[PDB]
Amino acid sequence: ATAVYRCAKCGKEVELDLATAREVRCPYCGSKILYKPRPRVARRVKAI
Amino acid sequence: MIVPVRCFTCGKVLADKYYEFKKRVEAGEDPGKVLDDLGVERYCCRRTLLSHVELIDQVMVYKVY
Amino acid sequence: EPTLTPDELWLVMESYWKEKGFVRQHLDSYNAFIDHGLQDVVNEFGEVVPDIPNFKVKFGKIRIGQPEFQEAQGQRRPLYPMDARIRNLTYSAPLYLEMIPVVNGIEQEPVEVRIGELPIMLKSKACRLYGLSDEELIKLGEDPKDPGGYFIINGSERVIVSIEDLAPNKTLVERDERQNKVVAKVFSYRHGYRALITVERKKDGILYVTIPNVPKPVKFVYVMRALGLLTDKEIVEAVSDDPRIQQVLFDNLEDASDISTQEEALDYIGRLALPGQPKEYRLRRAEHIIDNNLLPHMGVDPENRRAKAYYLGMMALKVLELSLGLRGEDDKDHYANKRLKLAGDLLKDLFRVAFGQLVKDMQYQMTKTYQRKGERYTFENIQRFVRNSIRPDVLSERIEHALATGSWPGGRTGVSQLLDRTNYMSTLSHLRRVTSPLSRDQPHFEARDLHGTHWGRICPTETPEGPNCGLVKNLALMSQITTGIPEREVREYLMKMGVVPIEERRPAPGLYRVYLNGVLIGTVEDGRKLVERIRADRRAGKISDVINVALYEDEEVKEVYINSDDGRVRRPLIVVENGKPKLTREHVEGIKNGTLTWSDLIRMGVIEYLDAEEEENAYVATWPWEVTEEHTHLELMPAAILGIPASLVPYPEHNAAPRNTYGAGMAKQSLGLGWANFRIRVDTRGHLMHYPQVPLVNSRIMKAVGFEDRPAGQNFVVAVLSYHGYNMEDAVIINKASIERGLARSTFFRTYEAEEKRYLGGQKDNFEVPSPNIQGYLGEKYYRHLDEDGLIFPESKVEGKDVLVGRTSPPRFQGRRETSVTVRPSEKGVVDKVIVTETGDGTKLVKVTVRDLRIPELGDKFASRHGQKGVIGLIVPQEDMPWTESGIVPDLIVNPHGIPSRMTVGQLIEAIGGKVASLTGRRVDGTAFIGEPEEKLRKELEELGFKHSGREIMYDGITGRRLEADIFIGVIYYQRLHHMVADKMHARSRGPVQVLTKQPTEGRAREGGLRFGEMERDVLIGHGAAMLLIERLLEESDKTEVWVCESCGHLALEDKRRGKVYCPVCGEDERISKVEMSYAFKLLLDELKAMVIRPSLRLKDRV
DNA sequence: ACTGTCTGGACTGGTCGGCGCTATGATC
DNA sequence: GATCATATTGTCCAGACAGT
Ligand SMILES: [Zn+2]
Ligand SMILES: [Zn+2]
Ligand SMILES: [Zn+2]
């Protein structure tokens, strides 16, 4: 159940499996806060 | 945070001429004459252009992803 | 030379606000606490002596490092406020205190061991954001306009509201009319302990002394004898030498002549404190009580006991003079006698308590280690022995918890509150907030009302409503709070200036007494000359500006007061000599050019800070053109007497005081771009205005405050007119086209948190989509927005009870439980963001921020800046709205009945100014007392081609005909409030009930019911509706059936297994009846039975 | 029989929203 | 390391009560 995540500071893609994660962080810059990327499935928003 | 497209009272488009108005204001000219030459005659559209403050540039710096 | 203009004074005030800021009291107090307060507490504690023969540990210097956090793995990394907020971490820094073991009297090598983590104030000297530019703060995810001055505890911002307490170690005298006595009280402070020492004189002329933990007031002469004075003459001149005072003292010791020695008075004190005890036990108890309770601020050693008697004498005079008319009763609400405990003092007290408990814990730890291991292991390595016997968390969990729940040691509560993040105004108001220790339900007529000493220190209008009125205030814009300075230097300076010490010369009627921070230090021959010399030295920069000198020259008594302590709220005033202010045009030019700063102006004595005590000797001039030879000071900015939210009101002098109070209170409830980093913030609730606008009629202070950069409202074209009765009773009518065009559009963000908590035995939560086979499955469609990791996808539309984070819990005492975090049933929106991180224990934490678009509708609260508020009554289409001859359709319509009833002329002036500003393009100044005059505004409105009154010829939107009256239409700044109808609608038919009373739950978050209170029952009884009351209170809330035994009235027991109903106390398997009643009544019967009360229900036939 | 003193109880209702807490020093 | 018994004992009004 691994998934891709976006780092809060550097913004690069971070790949890890939250089910069996001993520790979740961005290895590129050491940041411990990650953002879930927006899905590419098209969403429809009513104009006002 | 961004200039509204239309005036809230009559729907007159003002976002096109807002940046020109802001640039002319920063040059030291009287904003009333700037609004006059830009076709902004009704004071409701003048209200929309004058009272608006740009803040989107300070929100873009905080990335969300 | 010209007499100056208010624009120059405004420039000076702007420089003052730029140099210091608006949260200076918190930052300065925290810096003072960090620099020496920890060291003062450590030196006060001194050393720890455990149960080890011939060994002790003394404390050295204590320092604080950079804010850092240690993860579960063990990695120490720098900590930032944004990371602390997101990851629910406490923004704290380690405290390192060196420990020097002492073996056989020989000092050993110092050991530096961390003693805990102290929370760090935002933007303080110990914070990582100190000295950073706007770009650096932006790169760290921090708003450059954020003032700081608060604490982050467990990811939640905590602000310490200042406390308006009495002046410590100061005697205040008053007369009780009901008791017919003169009472003087002093709150002596020692190491965070407060003792209320009281001296009273009843109608009989005797003097009584009230000491805490003493059940009865004992005579003043008895304590005076037990304090060290033996003979009557000692008590005779320990107070004064005035013949009336001497004769009162003679009467006192004649009445109290039954006790002549110290032992008898101590025996009396011990007997009153502990009756029925041996004589020596009472003696030592009384000695300890006198040492640790009778004026602890003078010390605890018996050596200073005699000096305490002197402090008693100065009390007695204060009691005697008011009893004889020599002196008047001082005001308890006067700010000269009132101090302001800031965050630094409360932090010092909390750190003292935590450090004392840590010291006792370390003493127990070393005692246990020495008793277990022995002398061989203890003294083989004294560096490791001391370090291993320390539990830092024991300290830390006492500090941050007091900063979490707001409860302080000593019974003080509500010290720390959640920081208000509704908009830019609310946070500043909370950071400049002052509370009072008085109870909210108490009617405090003399305390809640505004005082004359609040000018320039307390905002006169911005106060809350209800029970919080008066007791909760806000600091004025020009209010300045003093910082602590070494009192020994001030005392030495006073002594060297010519003040004879008290121990050298006795007080005389012809001599001026000199008081330092409420403590008499001596007498001088010429008090006025000394006061003038001190003021001249302060103006010359020789001494610090913290010292304030005042002279009280009455016909009976003469005194000189010098104050250099904390908690004194002061205001800046321009010094005027010989009718000429010290501030000239050259100083203003230097301020404008940047060569001169506010601190430079303070240094030369041109502008000085005055507290309430010194201002009693000052004669202030309101305006620069009103200065005379007798004037001593000039007001800098009369508009600066208001608070930060109160300055938002344009032309507050043209509005009623309750209207100004309502407008100031509602300025914090408005919605707008308060913070630029709102999207990355993890606030549990937040609001955003889509198109915020700076008001066209705004005070000049709002530009300096920062409200123009962070607006919280929009300018509305409001026409005052009656429209179909839908604007009636404070209601407003909004334009449908304006709403559809984005006017007053707002977005509401709610943040939910889910933690993968770990339980005992290795059990932990799992982030995954729950299987349908497990119990507690909400439904198949509720997890449709979840990903394979159990987290909701961003930009996903959600509804009520929609699953955001799929969490599974281990079963209690079977399949795994369901503990998924869901949206509120009455709330919806779109998922804005999802954040995955870890907590302080290393467990996973997912924060989901969901945004909902809030288009204005009926019931949405909109308020003007002048206290005019109301909900939307109708969404009128643009074609139905009236329009003026100039082609302007109002964006809002208000009832004309509300304008004159509430005496709101400032709203009309603001409408005129907004129309003028829109037509001319130049913003209209709305500052108090220096704003653009109304007549000038009408003049330019006439010159612009419009009517002077602002009335315009309007045509009806439905009939199309011209209205017979010219309608007043103008631009008024109207702000949308957070009291939206979307978050306020509640509707419950049936659902969850309380486990105790079997009644509907509380609030709206858990689908609770609506309370039918006692008053509703009373009015239902008055209506005569018996069956309606039965249906409401009983048939719809807690209806139940019970079995009652007819023989004894006890509640019978029904056994389903046996299938039979019988009375256990009585038997009676036949005569049992079913009775319908409320479950609350059954609970009451159970409570009565538990209270050893037997209720016997005598049953009666229904017919 | 009066008089000041000690002791006891209550301090309008309702609602929205949040924050935070409810173990530990021995024992094998 | 994993467990386990214990974990301290603000005002005002009205009624009852020693004192003179
Ligand atoms: Zn990264
Ligand atoms: Zn318009
Ligand atoms: Zn029975």
Short mmCIF file of N, CA and C in Angstrom, two decimals, chain C residues 385-488:
data_model
loop_
_atom_site.label_atom_id
_atom_site.label_comp_id
_atom_site.label_asym_id
_atom_site.label_seq_id
_atom_site.Cartn_x
_atom_site.Cartn_y
_atom_site.Cartn_z
N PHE C 385 26.65 10.27 39.10
CA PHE C 385 25.65 10.05 40.13
C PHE C 385 24.61 11.16 40.15
N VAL C 386 25.05 12.42 40.04
CA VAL C 386 24.12 13.54 40.06
C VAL C 386 23.29 13.58 38.78
N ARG C 387 23.93 13.32 37.63
CA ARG C 387 23.23 13.39 36.35
C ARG C 387 22.15 12.32 36.24
N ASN C 388 22.44 11.10 36.70
CA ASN C 388 21.47 10.01 36.57
C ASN C 388 20.29 10.16 37.53
N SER C 389 20.43 10.97 38.58
CA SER C 389 19.36 11.16 39.55
C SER C 389 18.45 12.34 39.21
N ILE C 390 18.35 12.70 37.93
CA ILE C 390 17.57 13.84 37.48
C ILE C 390 16.58 13.37 36.43
N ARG C 391 15.31 13.73 36.62
CA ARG C 391 14.27 13.46 35.62
C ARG C 391 13.79 14.79 35.06
N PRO C 392 14.32 15.23 33.91
CA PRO C 392 13.92 16.55 33.38
C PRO C 392 12.44 16.67 33.07
N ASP C 393 11.82 15.60 32.57
CA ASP C 393 10.43 15.66 32.15
C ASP C 393 9.51 16.02 33.32
N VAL C 394 9.89 15.62 34.54
CA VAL C 394 9.10 15.96 35.72
C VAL C 394 8.93 17.47 35.83
N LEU C 395 9.99 18.23 35.52
CA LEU C 395 9.85 19.68 35.44
C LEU C 395 9.00 20.07 34.24
N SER C 396 9.30 19.51 33.07
CA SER C 396 8.71 19.99 31.82
C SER C 396 7.20 19.79 31.82
N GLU C 397 6.74 18.60 32.23
CA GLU C 397 5.31 18.33 32.26
C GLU C 397 4.57 19.16 33.30
N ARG C 398 5.27 19.84 34.20
CA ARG C 398 4.60 20.81 35.06
C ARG C 398 4.50 22.18 34.39
N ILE C 399 5.46 22.54 33.55
CA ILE C 399 5.45 23.87 32.94
C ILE C 399 4.43 23.93 31.81
N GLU C 400 4.63 23.12 30.77
CA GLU C 400 3.80 23.22 29.57
C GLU C 400 2.35 22.88 29.86
N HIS C 401 2.09 21.99 30.83
CA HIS C 401 0.72 21.70 31.22
C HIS C 401 0.04 22.95 31.78
N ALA C 402 0.76 23.72 32.60
CA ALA C 402 0.22 24.98 33.07
C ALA C 402 0.03 25.97 31.92
N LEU C 403 0.80 25.82 30.85
CA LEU C 403 0.60 26.61 29.64
C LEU C 403 -0.38 25.96 28.68
N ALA C 404 -0.89 24.77 29.00
CA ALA C 404 -1.85 24.08 28.16
C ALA C 404 -3.28 24.28 28.66
N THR C 405 -3.54 23.94 29.92
CA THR C 405 -4.86 24.12 30.50
C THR C 405 -5.09 25.53 31.03
N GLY C 406 -4.05 26.36 31.12
CA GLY C 406 -4.18 27.70 31.64
C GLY C 406 -4.24 27.80 33.15
N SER C 407 -4.07 26.69 33.87
CA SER C 407 -4.11 26.69 35.32
C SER C 407 -2.73 26.96 35.89
N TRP C 408 -2.63 27.95 36.77
CA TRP C 408 -1.37 28.35 37.37
C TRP C 408 -1.31 27.90 38.83
N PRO C 409 -0.11 27.66 39.36
CA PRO C 409 0.00 27.31 40.78
C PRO C 409 -0.47 28.45 41.68
N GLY C 410 -1.03 28.09 42.82
CA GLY C 410 -1.55 29.06 43.76
C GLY C 410 -3.01 29.39 43.61
N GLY C 411 -3.76 28.62 42.83
CA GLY C 411 -5.17 28.86 42.63
C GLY C 411 -5.51 29.78 41.47
N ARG C 412 -4.51 30.42 40.87
CA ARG C 412 -4.75 31.27 39.70
C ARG C 412 -5.05 30.40 38.49
N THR C 413 -6.08 30.76 37.74
CA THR C 413 -6.50 29.99 36.59
C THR C 413 -6.92 30.94 35.47
N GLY C 414 -6.90 30.41 34.24
CA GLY C 414 -7.18 31.23 33.08
C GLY C 414 -6.04 32.13 32.66
N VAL C 415 -4.82 31.86 33.13
CA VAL C 415 -3.68 32.70 32.79
C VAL C 415 -3.35 32.58 31.31
N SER C 416 -3.29 31.35 30.80
CA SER C 416 -2.98 31.08 29.40
C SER C 416 -4.24 30.67 28.67
N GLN C 417 -4.52 31.32 27.55
CA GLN C 417 -5.70 31.05 26.75
C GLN C 417 -5.29 30.74 25.32
N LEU C 418 -6.22 30.14 24.57
CA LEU C 418 -5.98 29.89 23.16
C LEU C 418 -5.96 31.20 22.39
N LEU C 419 -4.93 31.39 21.57
CA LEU C 419 -4.80 32.63 20.81
C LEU C 419 -5.89 32.72 19.75
N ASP C 420 -6.56 33.87 19.70
CA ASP C 420 -7.63 34.08 18.74
C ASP C 420 -7.04 34.31 17.35
N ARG C 421 -7.49 33.51 16.38
CA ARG C 421 -6.99 33.57 15.01
C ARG C 421 -8.12 33.85 14.03
N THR C 422 -9.17 34.53 14.48
CA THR C 422 -10.28 34.87 13.58
C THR C 422 -9.83 35.82 12.48
N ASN C 423 -9.05 36.83 12.83
CA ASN C 423 -8.52 37.79 11.87
C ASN C 423 -7.29 38.44 12.48
N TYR C 424 -6.79 39.48 11.80
CA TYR C 424 -5.61 40.19 12.29
C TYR C 424 -5.89 40.96 13.57
N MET C 425 -7.11 41.48 13.73
CA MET C 425 -7.42 42.32 14.88
C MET C 425 -7.52 41.50 16.16
N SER C 426 -8.10 40.30 16.07
CA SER C 426 -8.37 39.50 17.26
C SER C 426 -7.08 39.05 17.93
N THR C 427 -6.07 38.65 17.14
CA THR C 427 -4.81 38.21 17.72
C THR C 427 -4.10 39.34 18.45
N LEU C 428 -4.08 40.54 17.86
CA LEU C 428 -3.48 41.68 18.54
C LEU C 428 -4.25 42.04 19.81
N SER C 429 -5.58 41.99 19.75
CA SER C 429 -6.38 42.28 20.93
C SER C 429 -6.11 41.28 22.05
N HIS C 430 -5.98 39.99 21.70
CA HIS C 430 -5.69 38.98 22.71
C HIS C 430 -4.28 39.14 23.26
N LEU C 431 -3.32 39.52 22.42
CA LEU C 431 -1.96 39.74 22.89
C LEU C 431 -1.84 41.00 23.73
N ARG C 432 -2.79 41.93 23.61
CA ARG C 432 -2.83 43.13 24.43
C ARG C 432 -4.01 43.10 25.40
N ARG C 433 -4.29 41.93 25.97
CA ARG C 433 -5.46 41.73 26.82
C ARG C 433 -5.06 41.68 28.29
N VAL C 434 -5.89 42.29 29.14
CA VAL C 434 -5.68 42.32 30.58
C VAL C 434 -6.95 41.81 31.25
N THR C 435 -6.80 40.85 32.15
CA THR C 435 -7.89 40.31 32.94
C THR C 435 -7.73 40.73 34.39
N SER C 436 -8.73 40.38 35.20
CA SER C 436 -8.74 40.72 36.62
C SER C 436 -9.03 39.47 37.44
N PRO C 437 -8.48 39.39 38.66
CA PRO C 437 -8.75 38.22 39.51
C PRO C 437 -10.15 38.20 40.10
N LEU C 438 -10.92 39.28 39.97
CA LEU C 438 -12.26 39.33 40.54
C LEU C 438 -13.20 38.38 39.81
N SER C 439 -14.18 37.87 40.55
CA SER C 439 -15.15 36.94 39.98
C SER C 439 -16.05 37.66 38.98
N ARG C 440 -16.43 36.94 37.92
CA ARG C 440 -17.23 37.55 36.86
C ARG C 440 -18.67 37.79 37.29
N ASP C 441 -19.22 36.90 38.12
CA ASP C 441 -20.60 37.07 38.58
C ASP C 441 -20.76 38.18 39.61
N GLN C 442 -19.67 38.64 40.22
CA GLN C 442 -19.77 39.66 41.25
C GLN C 442 -20.07 41.02 40.63
N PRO C 443 -21.03 41.78 41.16
CA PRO C 443 -21.22 43.16 40.71
C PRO C 443 -20.16 44.08 41.29
N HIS C 444 -19.20 44.48 40.46
CA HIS C 444 -18.11 45.35 40.88
C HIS C 444 -18.37 46.73 40.28
N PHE C 445 -19.19 47.52 40.98
CA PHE C 445 -19.54 48.85 40.48
C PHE C 445 -18.33 49.77 40.47
N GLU C 446 -17.49 49.69 41.50
CA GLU C 446 -16.31 50.54 41.58
C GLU C 446 -15.13 50.02 40.78
N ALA C 447 -15.17 48.77 40.33
CA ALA C 447 -14.05 48.17 39.60
C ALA C 447 -14.31 47.99 38.12
N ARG C 448 -15.54 47.64 37.73
CA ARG C 448 -15.83 47.46 36.31
C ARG C 448 -15.91 48.79 35.57
N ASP C 449 -16.34 49.85 36.26
CA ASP C 449 -16.51 51.14 35.60
C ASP C 449 -15.16 51.74 35.21
N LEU C 450 -15.19 52.58 34.18
CA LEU C 450 -13.98 53.21 33.68
C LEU C 450 -13.42 54.18 34.72
N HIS C 451 -12.09 54.23 34.81
CA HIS C 451 -11.39 55.08 35.75
C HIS C 451 -10.67 56.20 35.01
N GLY C 452 -10.44 57.31 35.71
CA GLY C 452 -9.74 58.43 35.12
C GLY C 452 -8.27 58.18 34.88
N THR C 453 -7.69 57.21 35.58
CA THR C 453 -6.29 56.84 35.37
C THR C 453 -6.11 55.88 34.20
N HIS C 454 -7.19 55.45 33.56
CA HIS C 454 -7.11 54.59 32.39
C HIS C 454 -6.78 55.36 31.12
N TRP C 455 -6.72 56.69 31.19
CA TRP C 455 -6.37 57.50 30.03
C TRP C 455 -4.95 57.19 29.58
N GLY C 456 -4.81 56.72 28.34
CA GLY C 456 -3.52 56.40 27.78
C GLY C 456 -2.96 55.05 28.19
N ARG C 457 -3.68 54.29 29.01
CA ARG C 457 -3.23 52.98 29.47
C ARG C 457 -4.23 51.88 29.17
N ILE C 458 -5.53 52.15 29.31
CA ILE C 458 -6.58 51.17 29.08
C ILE C 458 -7.55 51.76 28.07
N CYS C 459 -7.92 50.96 27.07
CA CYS C 459 -8.86 51.42 26.06
C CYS C 459 -10.21 51.71 26.69
N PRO C 460 -10.79 52.89 26.45
CA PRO C 460 -12.05 53.24 27.12
C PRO C 460 -13.28 52.57 26.54
N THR C 461 -13.21 52.03 25.33
CA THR C 461 -14.40 51.49 24.67
C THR C 461 -14.35 50.00 24.42
N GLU C 462 -13.19 49.45 24.04
CA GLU C 462 -13.10 48.04 23.67
C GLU C 462 -13.13 47.19 24.93
N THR C 463 -14.33 46.78 25.33
CA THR C 463 -14.54 45.87 26.44
C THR C 463 -15.56 44.82 26.02
N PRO C 464 -15.46 43.61 26.56
CA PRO C 464 -16.46 42.58 26.24
C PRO C 464 -17.79 42.86 26.92
N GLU C 465 -18.81 42.14 26.47
CA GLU C 465 -20.15 42.26 27.02
C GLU C 465 -20.40 41.16 28.05
N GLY C 466 -21.53 41.29 28.75
CA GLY C 466 -21.92 40.31 29.73
C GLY C 466 -21.12 40.42 31.02
N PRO C 467 -20.92 39.29 31.69
CA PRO C 467 -20.18 39.31 32.96
C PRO C 467 -18.72 39.73 32.82
N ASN C 468 -18.15 39.65 31.62
CA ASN C 468 -16.76 40.02 31.40
C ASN C 468 -16.57 41.53 31.23
N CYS C 469 -17.65 42.31 31.24
CA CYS C 469 -17.54 43.75 31.05
C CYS C 469 -16.81 44.39 32.22
N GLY C 470 -15.88 45.28 31.91
CA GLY C 470 -15.11 45.96 32.94
C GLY C 470 -13.93 45.20 33.50
N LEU C 471 -14.12 43.93 33.84
CA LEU C 471 -13.03 43.13 34.40
C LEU C 471 -12.01 42.73 33.35
N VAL C 472 -12.38 42.72 32.07
CA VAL C 472 -11.47 42.40 30.98
C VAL C 472 -11.30 43.65 30.13
N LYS C 473 -10.06 44.13 30.02
CA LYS C 473 -9.73 45.35 29.30
C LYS C 473 -8.63 45.06 28.29
N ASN C 474 -8.31 46.08 27.49
CA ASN C 474 -7.24 45.99 26.51
C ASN C 474 -6.30 47.17 26.67
N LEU C 475 -5.02 46.92 26.43
CA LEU C 475 -4.02 47.97 26.56
C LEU C 475 -4.22 49.04 25.50
N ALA C 476 -3.99 50.29 25.89
CA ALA C 476 -4.09 51.40 24.95
C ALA C 476 -2.94 51.36 23.95
N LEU C 477 -3.12 52.09 22.85
CA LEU C 477 -2.10 52.11 21.80
C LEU C 477 -0.81 52.77 22.27
N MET C 478 -0.91 53.74 23.17
CA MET C 478 0.26 54.41 23.72
C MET C 478 0.71 53.83 25.05
N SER C 479 0.08 52.75 25.51
CA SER C 479 0.42 52.18 26.81
C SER C 479 1.81 51.55 26.76
N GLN C 480 2.64 51.87 27.75
CA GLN C 480 3.97 51.31 27.89
C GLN C 480 4.11 50.69 29.27
N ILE C 481 4.71 49.50 29.32
CA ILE C 481 4.86 48.75 30.56
C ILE C 481 6.34 48.68 30.91
N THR C 482 6.66 48.96 32.17
CA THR C 482 8.04 49.08 32.60
C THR C 482 8.73 47.72 32.64
N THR C 483 10.06 47.77 32.55
CA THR C 483 10.92 46.60 32.67
C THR C 483 11.74 46.71 33.95
N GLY C 484 11.99 45.57 34.59
CA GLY C 484 12.66 45.58 35.87
C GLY C 484 14.09 46.08 35.77
N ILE C 485 14.49 46.87 36.76
CA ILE C 485 15.86 47.37 36.89
C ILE C 485 16.33 47.08 38.31
N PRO C 486 17.64 46.96 38.51
CA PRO C 486 18.16 46.71 39.87
C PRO C 486 17.79 47.83 40.83
N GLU C 487 17.01 47.47 41.85
CA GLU C 487 16.55 48.45 42.83
C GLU C 487 17.67 48.95 43.73
N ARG C 488 18.73 48.17 43.91
CA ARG C 488 19.84 48.60 44.76
C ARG C 488 20.54 49.82 44.18
#
